[PDB]
Write a protein that binds this ligand. Structure first.
Ligand SMILES: Nc1ncnc2c1ncn2[C@@H]1O[C@H](COP(=O)(O)OP(=O)(O)O)[C@@H](O)[C@H]1O
Ligand SMILES: Nc1ncnc2c1ncn2[C@@H]1O[C@H](COP(=O)(O)OP(=O)(O)O)[C@@H](O)[C@H]1O
Ligand SMILES: Nc1ncnc2c1ncn2[C@@H]1O[C@H](COP(=O)(O)OP(=O)(O)O)[C@@H](O)[C@H]1O
Ligand SMILES: Nc1ncnc2c1ncn2[C@@H]1O[C@H](COP(=O)(O)OP(=O)(O)O)[C@@H](O)[C@H]1O
Ligand SMILES: Nc1ncnc2c1ncn2[C@@H]1O[C@H](COP(=O)(O)OP(=O)(O)O)[C@@H](O)[C@H]1O
Ligand SMILES: [Mg+2]
Ligand SMILES: [Mg+2]
Ligand SMILES: [Mg+2]
Ligand SMILES: [Mg+2]
Ligand SMILES: [Mg+2]
Lengths: 366, 366, 366, 366, 366
């Protein structure tokens, strides 16, 4: 069987092709002690670093879909194969994922490590938005994939991708966490360390939601108190947040909140559709597929439906497809693809990599 | 039974002799994907290419009645026999059509393909304007046949053709579509791709008409707004056109709109009659037969009646015969001819083609 | 009853002896298609060829009273018996006519065809000018017979012919038609084909007349416009002719207009009278009988009266007998002769023709 | 000195009497721009219109020897006098030419323009075939003159013309150009515009020839490829023609190729001789004089010799006189005639034209 | 003196007629602050917006030759007259330019603003490709004008335009900048904001060039490193690009790189020549005039020469005219035209605009 590893900027999702859910889901972090030992490992990975984060400096080796720390990334891959999955990587072909419009050297270093450090027999790097469409059982649709580092739109029609219409936005979950950390200081809550950033991320996943109309919601939060929620910190302190619950996800639709010039995910989706041929726009309007953890906010599909309806012609039927399992859509689609008999010829074996060089990894790549 | 295939520049009309309507009417197009596949056939033909035109480059194998892409033309013939008609071509004699004054090699290659690729038992290539006269139940008349590529006038009197009076004009429906694409840019509508050319052709068939007096109609469209019509594009956008509705078909009467030096179809019809013997002109004046899709504009028979009346002597009775089924007149006449018992000796069998060579196909051909 | 067939160079006049008018009068033409058939007979005869002359080449089998195309002449005789008269020629004796001073083989071939192809029981070939005198109820007079091919003068006195005084002129209606075609080019009217020659013949029969004084009429046509007449062509075009109306028949009196050296019909008539015995000239002067279609011009009897009066002595009484039915005088006289009881011994039966050979047909023949 | 202007349907040949060649030879065309000027004259004449024909509509003011556009004909005469010859027409008597059997008003309008617009002192309109006989130094012969519009036969014997034997055929070089344009479509070459008609005329003058035996030549062209010739178009495209080289001039001998009913130039020449007196036919048989550009095909004199030999009695000596300068024979003969001292009394002066009216111009005219 | 303003999609070029270079050349941009002021104008135009682009959102009011933001376009015209040229527009006639095949309302709004907002005495809207031909001192040639928004081919022959042969391509410098921004992400360089798009445009103008053979150049860049160039960003960062230098301009010859279906500028130029009359193609082949900033790539004339030579017949002489000043050819030609004495009647004065309405501005317009 093949291994399917979805290395996101935030979470590692690994498992075996044919399964319906990842077997190993843990944070893509490496923690190192920032104090002096007096009485123990030198670095902690994943959930181990998450339980000891009080005395660690946590670092993400992947930033905006681009692997920046290759020594830390190998520790995470090593822990994925030997600790979480407990397999020998030299026996399973490995399907990896990558965001579109990434640097070419990122995929070439991933391939060199898998073939020369882990000695995988074969491997393949798929585009995350294409796997997300396999998971929904579709061949046509525009995928909005938003994870921890990257948000991207990829339109696909009858199995054909339109690379010139691909949009990429370096604004996802990690930027929303940093913005929530900033606006929490308005109530006197100070989260500074990398360990406290993990607390704010947990606050974001529990209490944040997308408002249907942002200006009406800002007036409701300023008048009454029905939007206030409480949250208990790990040390028993209780914090209460009001309009920060919907001001944080609103950055997805108004990136100027964090000083970005780009348009929101609704205009970016609409602009990607308008770059496509006029004859396929009607099918793309009816097949807006959402995937990734950053699309898991309550009310984001209704807000997305409302914003694109206002941009598109009134005759078009806008349909946002947001399954409840869309947090694992890239992995589930990769599990489906790696099990197809037609795909078994797409593997890049170790023999082909030695004779064709690193240039063989850029096939069907955009 | 015999097969009747009317291969126009725009549409394929195929069926069985004895029927009153073609069984298969689909566009004579071959589409090939112009993007990268990521998830499918290599080429699409006919209505299949029309429904996927968003991701295809559409090409017509026939241009101005002359087959230019013989590999694509065989795909269309193959799809006609096996997909649309679902017959074995080696069991039915095939009646084909052709515009007059075509290159000799065009008919010789059509015959070689039908005998050596499809292995038809017998075949015959008729002149389209002669079949159009069979459809109207006449033996005398001048036929104005205008399709997608060619407009031609063929005068016939008591079953005798006058080849020296045959006029051919490389200006038909496809040139009107290209001219409509050009004048639509005056309102800011940009149709560029081959798929968008199919949208403009659909606009032309729905909204364009022939003005009785062009200068009076240009003054009416410039003063009020009663001539404005709206049309919804496939993506919900609504376009509104005014004088473009009658400026596009006016090119048939003023070919200088597209930079051509020839005279309009009314003068060409009159010049063809004046090249005939004086004793038959009165019968030709009363039997102007229209055929083809480009004669389907509302008001073209009244305009044709008005223009030829102004050219002919005032004592002559000008009568334009334009039946509502004239879009299929060539096929209907070919169905009538292929069912005549007298015609059963006109078939060019496979045996005659082997002993007489390709020169046998140029009999009763002009 | 007997058949009377007057085979002129221009018209066939056939009927039954005892009647007062021919039952079948149609042009002596055979037309053959000069174009390609695409949708019909191989040749057309008589009025059928006249209605389809637009697509035919028309040929006269008789030229200057001499049958030149014997295959076409048999088609005309066949159509006369079976289509126009609808009789069996093997049951009726046939009276035929012939111009004087014809080749001997012309009458011998006519007799061989009537006896061996149509199997007539008996036949007789009369001289046309003698029949013309029977029609006027006379035994004395000089007959001026002018048809389509031949003009001839035959003087007869008390039932006796004077063959040495017979004049023959190869100038008749067909030469006048050709001359009218030539002088019509002076006004820009171009009649070239054999079908257009039939149009000019119709113009000649409607608008041409004989001027009493040619030089005074030429001055009147050159000064005013009262002699101009209009004529509508079969295609609606209107032509206008002035002095051509009387210049065409003037060729009969001035054969030098068409390059002939002979004298006009007035001098030829006078020369024929002066070749006769002096004692019969007074009776011939008073009995100038006109016959044939070429004597049907308005004013030809007054002009003939004026010209012969100027040549003859002033004491003689010149009387031109021109009945209104003189276009059929040869047939009417043949109908009278074939009904006489005295003539019933003059028939050349099939039995006499077999035993006496072809030489029996030259009896009372000049 | 006198001016000699030979206004043919195709070329203008002008010069001074006494010279042996025309000083000005240019096409008789008037071109007008058929596009929009954005950056120039309103009309171009002659060689100027020929060098700018790409953006012009070219029109011939003379069609079949008959001046149809009198405003354009005056531009050509104006350019002849002031630009090409650079003379004052009010100082030189002008000898003009005309085809026989032309409309009377054509010569009367030419005379009115020369006397009232150009104010020539005297003028004379000669018959083209008579001038062609002056050029060959003969007084007896039948002239076959074939130019761009008209082909005509004029027999002359000892200085006497036989007008009744004059044949005129509206089939010359321009009809051969149009027929070559038609049969070039058999190889896929499309020449449509008036500018492209000038290209086909240049092809005809370079590659066309008269076959000695047409059926043997058709078999040679269909078997091998030795008759194929190449020709480079003005834009670098190379066309190759085979049997079209001799099928185009064959129309002169088989006018049915273009749907004409008349006989070829060989039968027309023979028919003209047979209309002449029997005593002069032997001299006409030995003096067949060819003139005009349409007699410049290679092998037309040998073919003409062969065809007339087959029609004439075997004892007659058929001699076709075709000098290499016969393209200018009408002008050269007009230069000889205008220099004769005997001719100096034949001029129609301006004084005679005012007192005698337009009727004076029809003297020695047929 | 007259004002000549060449409003391109990218640059404004303004000056006075009679000068040899524009006096004011600045970017056609309007920038507005996208941050909060704490310590200043509300919008910046031209070079002022370019020096403060760090805190601005830059917008082009002209997109693909079509003015989309009319309020911003008036700010640019206002800054052109009063700041850059420092004149009173109510005293100078203004010559404006426009791309062919533009919407009719674009030119009508430009005229209404110049007459009612700036109160110019007269104005004229010329076609840019016609002015480019004035600059090269020619009357014949096909102009390839490629600026920031539009690429168009206009063939002109002897001062006559052929509007039916005009090609327009919505692919120019701005699309090349966007494509360079996309392929720079392959090396890890992220340019996203509108201010960073101006940095990429500066990279394109310094380092990009057209490869003579694209496939050989791709092999050279992949083997060695001689094609690598370095560029210093405004903040001191140094980027290095290799094959992106010639992959960006290659989009002009392979528009499929950016997902466009149209053919490259070489085939578009050849197709425009083949739509012209055959007699003018040789002159168009020798006079390919390049203009605009997008034709300023090193090696584009040699590549254009090589591509058209492969399409045209081998006998034709292909000559690409690319002067070193072709970046200002439209302005220089407009300065020449506005100084011609013949042009002084072409001005559309304020009086004519009031009585004739907005329809007067569409004269000599295509
Ligand atoms: N219920 C939730 N609501 C909002 N955000 C969530 C939720 N669950 C996860 N996320 C966010 O999703 C982001 C990453 O999810 P994932 O799709 O795994 O991205 P990646 O593929 O980059 O690892 C994290 O930043 C996390 O904060
Ligand atoms: N209702 C209509 N009005 C105007 N044009 C039409 C209409 N229907 C069809 N056409 C035109 O007729 C053309 C071809 O019709 P057809 O007679 O099938 O030609 P062909 O025989 O060349 O295929 C097409 O260009 C199409 O645009
Ligand atoms: N009304 C008429 N006026 C002048 N010519 C006439 C008239 N009617 C007939 N003809 C001429 O008479 C000629 C033949 O008449 P017809 O006496 O039948 O001669 P034929 O006996 O040779 O057939 C034709 O050429 C025709 O043109
Ligand atoms: N070498 C040649 N071969 C064949 N045809 C020629 C040649 N030269 C000229 N012609 C033809 O001669 C025709 C006219 O010649 P010309 O005698 O000047 O006639 P016109 O007197 O009517 O102007 C033109 O149609 C031209 O095509
Ligand atoms: N040296 C150069 N090399 C390549 N492109 C250039 C160069 N200089 C200018 N350009 C490009 O030319 C384009 C616009 O130039 P211009 O001719 O002024 O167009 P417009 O008339 O549309 O303003 C810009 O996109 C710019 O990038
Ligand atoms: Mg992800
Ligand atoms: Mg058709
Ligand atoms: Mg008779
Ligand atoms: Mg001539
Ligand atoms: Mg520009």
């Amino acid at each position: 069987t093949a291994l399917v590893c979805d290395n996101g900027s935030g979470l590692v999702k690994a498992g075996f092709a044919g399964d319906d859910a990842p077997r190993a889901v843990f944070p893509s972090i490496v923690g190192r002690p920032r104090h002096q030992g007096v009485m123990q490992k030198d670095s902690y990975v994943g959930d181990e670093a998450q339980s000891k984060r009080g005395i660690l400096t946590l670092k993400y080796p992947i930033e905006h879909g681009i692997i920046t720390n290759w020594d830390d990334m190998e520790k995470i891959w090593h822990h994925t194969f030997y600790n979480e999955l407990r397999v020998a990587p030299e026996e399973h072909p490995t399907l990896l994922t990558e965001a579109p419009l990434n640097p070419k050297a990122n995929r070439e270093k991933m391939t060199q490590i898998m073939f020369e450090t882990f000695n995988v027999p074969a491997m393949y790097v798929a585009i995350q938005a294409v796997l997300s469409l396999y998971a929904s059982g579709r061949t046509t649709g525009i995928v909005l994939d938003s994870g921890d580092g990257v948000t991207h739109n990829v339109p696909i029609y009858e199995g054909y991708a339109l690379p010139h219409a691909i949009m990429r936005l370096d604004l996802a979950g990690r930027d929303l966490t940093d913005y929530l950390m900033k606006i929490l200081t308005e109530r006197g809550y100070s989260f500074v360390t990398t360990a406290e950033r993990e607390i704010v991320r947990d606050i974001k996943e529990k209490l944040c939601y997308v408002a249907l109309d942002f200006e009406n919601e800002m007036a409701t939060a300023a008048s009454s108190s029905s939007l206030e929620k409480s949250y208990e910190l790990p040390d028993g302190q209780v914090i209460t947040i009001g309009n920060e619950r919907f001001r944080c996800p609103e950055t997805l639709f108004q990136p100027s909140f964090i000083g970005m010039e780009s348009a929101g995910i609704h205009e970016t989706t609409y602009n990607s559709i308008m770059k496509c041929d006029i004859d396929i726009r009607k099918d793309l309007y009816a097949n807006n597929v959402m995937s990734g953890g950053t699309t898991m906010y309550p009310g984001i599909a209704d807000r997305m439906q409302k914003e694109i309806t206002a941009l598109a012609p009134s005759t078009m039927k806008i349909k946002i497809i947001a399954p409840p399992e869309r947090k694992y859509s890239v992995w589930i689609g990769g599990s489906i693809l790696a099990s197809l008999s037609t795909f078994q010829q797409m593997w890049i074996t170790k023999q082909e990599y030695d004779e064709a060089g690193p240039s063989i990894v850029h096939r069907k790549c955009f």
